[PDB]
Symmetry: C3
Subunit: 206 residues, 3 copies
Amino acid sequence: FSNIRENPVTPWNPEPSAPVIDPTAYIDPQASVIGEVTIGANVMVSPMASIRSDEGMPIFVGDRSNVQDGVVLHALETINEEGEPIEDNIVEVDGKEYAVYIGNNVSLAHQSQVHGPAAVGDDTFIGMQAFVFKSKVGNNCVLEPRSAAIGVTIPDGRYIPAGMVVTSQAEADKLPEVTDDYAYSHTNEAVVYVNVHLAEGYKETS
Amino acid sequence: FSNIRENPVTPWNPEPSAPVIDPTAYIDPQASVIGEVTIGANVMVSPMASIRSDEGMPIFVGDRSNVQDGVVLHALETINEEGEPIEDNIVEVDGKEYAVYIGNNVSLAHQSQVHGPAAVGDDTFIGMQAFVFKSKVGNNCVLEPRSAAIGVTIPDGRYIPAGMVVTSQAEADKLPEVTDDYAYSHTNEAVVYVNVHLAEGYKETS
Amino acid sequence: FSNIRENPVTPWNPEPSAPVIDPTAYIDPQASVIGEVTIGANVMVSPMASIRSDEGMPIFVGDRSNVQDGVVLHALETINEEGEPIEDNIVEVDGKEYAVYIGNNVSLAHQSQVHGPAAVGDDTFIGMQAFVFKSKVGNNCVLEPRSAAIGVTIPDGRYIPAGMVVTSQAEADKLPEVTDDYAYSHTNEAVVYVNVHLAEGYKETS
Ligand SMILES: [Zn+2]
Ligand SMILES: [Zn+2]
Ligand SMILES: [Zn+2]
């Protein structure tokens, strides 16, 4: 079998698409990448990740971002039966439409999940086992381990404390701000540096 | 290696069993299905799922149900050392005994887990990253993302709010009811429709 | 591809290392084990687990311990750019340094994760979907399903209630004690017995 493959023909997908992966990205052999996916340069996709763009599409992962072990990306249907685009399930980023948009320099840590409709802004850390669904996470944010954002917009530069499940815009508006002395303030740039280097190192083993 | 395989011989499993999978089910090549498992028609098993019936057995997945990416099904021992059935670890559904019973038209969403002893009634949605263990989830229920049911019975037609961990029968008795205007009221039938079509589409690629 | 493999050359890893696995351990073909890892005797590594010692290293798993389906072990960098050991990210156990140390007779249940720097004492159960990061879990402990220990030390013989996220030493100091009548008091020794037997049974299929 191939772990990088096209999505299947369905009522909402007349024409199958294969992933477009930059030559500098590393897809582990035990990761799965299916369908209408764009993977940017220097991205590291770890073992057991599953990026599956067969329902809601497309799923984009920007440059120097990392999709860690066991992370799932998938999305709610973006085209219904009759060929109609379901706009509630589509996010818009820089004038383009996506089912899931992961920006540049974003870390999706181990066992986290981003389910479309969703967008994750540049230089944000999505912590271990965290969860994002029907939400827009701004740039320079931090979702600590086991936090979750569902149905909300997380303003730029804010963090979600470990274990907190954010389901209302009123709650997302009062999240705390990332400051220089906040414990995860430098976490994402370290992770990004590491993962870019791991992608290169692992590419030299293939 | 084969990803669909028999369980190993152990003190509690004198005779190995191989999965019984309907020809219309789709098992992704990167899913794992081991042992005394029954998979029904039109079921979709996604990448990185692990259905492992080697301890507690059998594990059943009914018709038109879906086991999404990274979902784990496994169960506590159902036969002890001396060949004795441990009745506390066995669930009974329609006069038959199972370690894990997943009914028909049930969605086990991405990264959720159902650990036996457990039963999940027809047309219920088990949300992303949710958890069911030592529990009986009725039919037409909804476990929102990151909810959990442990050691309880979830009455038919109720939902568990995102992030809520239900560990007592008193709590399960007062869960809210699914109504037409509840946000996840039509989620499972949409997921089921989609996953049945994905199973067929993916079967046409094999 | 090989699922058991060396870590890549990076700025912090001049010399690649391959896993040292006891002949009596069983590594499922759909598990991934990468880099500077030591796996002890009679250990069972299940489908979809990912043990990845490519950043923080080494990762040790002691005798008769089990790494269940979808469990991730990984760790923060232990050597920085300039070849300097980052002592805050290194744990010390019996006079030896590790990125992640999993002791003997420890169960890492399905979908849990232990992220270095971290140590987990002998005969402790890390429950389904639980999370340990920047913490030291003592021996004879129980992390119930969906519990978490972050940045703390969990004293020997204590348990963390299902769903509880422990982030402060004040909180970890007041956790409840495991007693004979506590519900998970015999869980780990049962799991260990089972998993040792599964490792042997599965080794007889290879
Ligand atoms: Zn989905
Ligand atoms: Zn289990
Ligand atoms: Zn990591």
